[model samples]
Structure formats: C-alpha cells, structure tokens
Target: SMRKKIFKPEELRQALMPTLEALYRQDPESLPFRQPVDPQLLGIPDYFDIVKNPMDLSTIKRKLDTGQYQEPWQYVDDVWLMFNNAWLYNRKTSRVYKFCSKLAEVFEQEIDPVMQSLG
Candidate 1:
C-alpha cells in the first residue's frame, strides 16, 4: 500500500530545499561558507571554501545575546527527536525502522557524486 512507493530524485531534492536553505544561507556560523570569492584570493586547493565574514562564536562573543547572529536552527550539538525525524523522513525508504542510523553514510553513498557532477 503506502509503503510501495519510489519518489523522483527531483521530488527528494525539492523536499529538502528548506533544509538546504537554512543549511547553506549566509549566516554568522554557516559552515562550508560559500559566499563571494575573490579571484585574487589565496588558494587552499579551493578559495571558494573560505568565508569572507567569518564569525565563530569563540572568535567573537562567547555567550548569550544570541539573535545578533541568528541560526534558525541548531546546526550541530545534536538536536534530539528532530534530527531523528529528519534522517528518517528524508530517506523515504519504506522499511520497518523509521530511522536512518547512518544518514551520513547514506548521503555520501547516494548524493555526493550527483552533487560533484560537472554540470
């Protein structure tokens, strides 16, 4: 019934748009910060991997008064049920277990090559 399903790749990407947005958007602590890169910048294999307006909390203020640099969600430090839900939901795999224990493995296995394409 409902378990018999396979979603289009486009649908999966579309489903994850909001997450990728929050993940990628310019913010104080955006990891893999890919803002504008100066052509004349230093090359560490890829200068685009650098952040122009770098803001690590330890590098700046080390305490609360948080909203000055708003991260809409916690990027790290493992949010509980939420991460569990995200992992499971994104997999879209109809299985007995509603959790992707190795989401990191799954992403690298399924998504990275598509992402690294020349196009």
Candidate 2:
C-alpha cells in the first residue's frame, strides 16, 4: 500500500552530506552550475524555455536543509537534473560541460552506492 512517508533528516545527511560538500568544493566559479543561472545576465534568451526545471547545487542544499526531499534518490535525482541541464545548454566541447561530466561521474562512483544502500 502507498503510505505517507515520514522524513528522516539524519538518514538523509548520512547518505548525502559528504558528497554534497565534495560537489560544492569543486570550483563554484569555473563550474557556475552551483547556483541558478541568470538567463538575462548569461544572455541565454531561451534558457528557461529549454530547461523547464532548472536545478542547481545551492537549491539542492536549501531543499536538503528544509527536508524537502523525502528519500535519498530524490536528492540524487536533483543532482543529476542539475548536470543534465548543463549538458543540454552547453556545447560538448565547452569547459563547463567537461567539468559537469566529470562531476556527474564522481557522483555516480562515490555517492550512488551510499544512496542505493540507504534506499
């Protein structure tokens, strides 16, 4: 039966807190995916239209802090979402895309096992 799940902050932290910090420790400026993109400032006029659900690391941190994520996968998915958007918007040869790819792989290699175990 489908039931309302009670949130557990400790479990969430145990699974993701370290990985989150690792992702943040990556150069925030070089990989500007840490915060929400400013479409106007970046001069990407159709960005919002293309990336309907814009996810970012800072937003994930806020969501994680507020207990908006009920499970580990939800948090992990948002991380992937953030990376996916970057891939979508940037050219494959771009520096941002290259870093984003490496970070995404790092998440898979490092955090994924923890998340899967917790889930």
Candidate 3:
C-alpha cells in the first residue's frame, strides 16, 4: 500500500509567503541606482577602519570616477574597502547601498556604450 501523505495548505502558504512576495512583488527595475563596489570580486582592505570619519557618497563617487590612484585596480580596491566598511558598520546604511547599486547600474549602462564606441 502507498504511504499516507499530509498536506497543510494554510501552513504552506504562510511559510512561503515571504519568498513568493519577494519574487512576484519586488521590482529590480524600479531601483535605478548602482553600487560602487563589487563585494565578490575584491576583498576589503584593513586601512579603512583607521579613518576618523565616514566618507560621503560624493566623495566615494569622486574616488571611483577620477581614477587618480596609482592603478585602476587600486581605485577598485579602495572602493571595495570603503563599501565593505560601510556595510559592516551598518547593513542598512543607505549611502553604502546606493553607492553599490549605482555603480552596478553605471557599469551595465556603459557596456553598450563601450561596445558601440569600439564598433
């Protein structure tokens, strides 16, 4: 004989509500900003902890856009460090989230521009 099965529809609905809402209701397109850092690609540096004060969004943006540092990678590294520090200090900090989100958007937007320019 086949084993009997139990199905609790209300319990299942409650359990899956959060994930379902996130999947169907959330809109990635609504957020137009990008992040200044790629958390996975670069490791945060230790030097950021020693700073006396936190950096603002404009400052972070300037650092990333100028590329005045010794190498492109250095700039990338610094941005990653700053962003990580911000996230570590406060996960909900809007500045950190906005910077990271916007950077991603900028990269995505520029991909086509670069490709077209080359062509």
Candidate 4:
C-alpha cells in the first residue's frame, strides 16, 4: 500500500524556498570544487583519497584545463539534472548523496541537513 501526502502550493513553496535560496547563493567559482570524479579514473584507493580531501576550486580548474580531469561539465550537468528529476519525484537517495557530498565537499557538514531538507 502507498501512503499519499498532500501539500498546498504555498506549503510546497515554503519547503523548497530555502534550497532555492541556497542554490542561488552558491558561488559559481565553487562549482568545480564540488565536481565528482569518475570512479574509474581514480580507481578505488585513489577515489577514496580524493573523497577524503576533495579538490579545491583552483585545483579542479587546473586539472580540467590540463585534462587531468575529463568531463567536468558532464559531472556538473548530471548533478543538476539528477537533482531536478529527484525533486519532481520527491525521491531521496541519489539527490541526498550528491547534494550532501557537494555541500560537505565545498562547505561543511553543518549545512548539509539544511540543504538536504530544503532540496
């Protein structure tokens, strides 16, 4: 059985407004910093290492320019598309993981819940 939840337009707006504001507030310069790497390129050990201390904006851009990191825009666009699709379905997993990873990577853990709930 499925449970149905109903929300007024304003309620929906209220729920989503914070996330929109946060996203709007995000610095474009930080976009590259939060970009996820291809698991295959980093492999398992390097991947974990990268995740532990994810690249900064300047490093990311340098890597992108040097072709050390390929498909930067694809990672960015995929994240955007996944987030938009997840919102439409009110789904959680990928959206939660990706956004939390992004926020945590660029900012701090404290901001994660705020972004996650709003998103």
Question: Local distance difference test, per candidate?
Answer: 0.32, 0.81, 0.39, 0.40
Quote model 4's TM-score. Answer: 0.28
Query: Residue 25 error for model 1, in Å?
Result: 3.1
lDDT of 1: 0.32
TM, every model: 0.26, 0.85, 0.31, 0.28
For candidate 1, lDDT tens digit of each residue in 2-108?
55344343443343333334433423323322332233553433322432333322322221122222221222222222234334433356331233333333333
Model 4 lDDT tens row, 18-48: 4333543566533423445445653534444
- What is the alpha-carbon lDDT for the whole of candidate 2? 0.81
- Encode model 2's per-residue lDDT on 26-88: one tens digit a residue: 774326877789999888789998899998888988888877888777888898899999999
lDDT of 3 by residue, 17-115 (tens): 232233223245212112333333546454345433444334444543443343333433543454445555534655545544544344345334433
- Find the candidate with the highest lDDT and give its number: 2
Better of 1 and 2 by lDDT: 2
Q: List candidate 2 segments past 4 Å from native.
A: 1-7, 28-30
RMSD of 1: 17.9
Best prediction by TM-score: 2
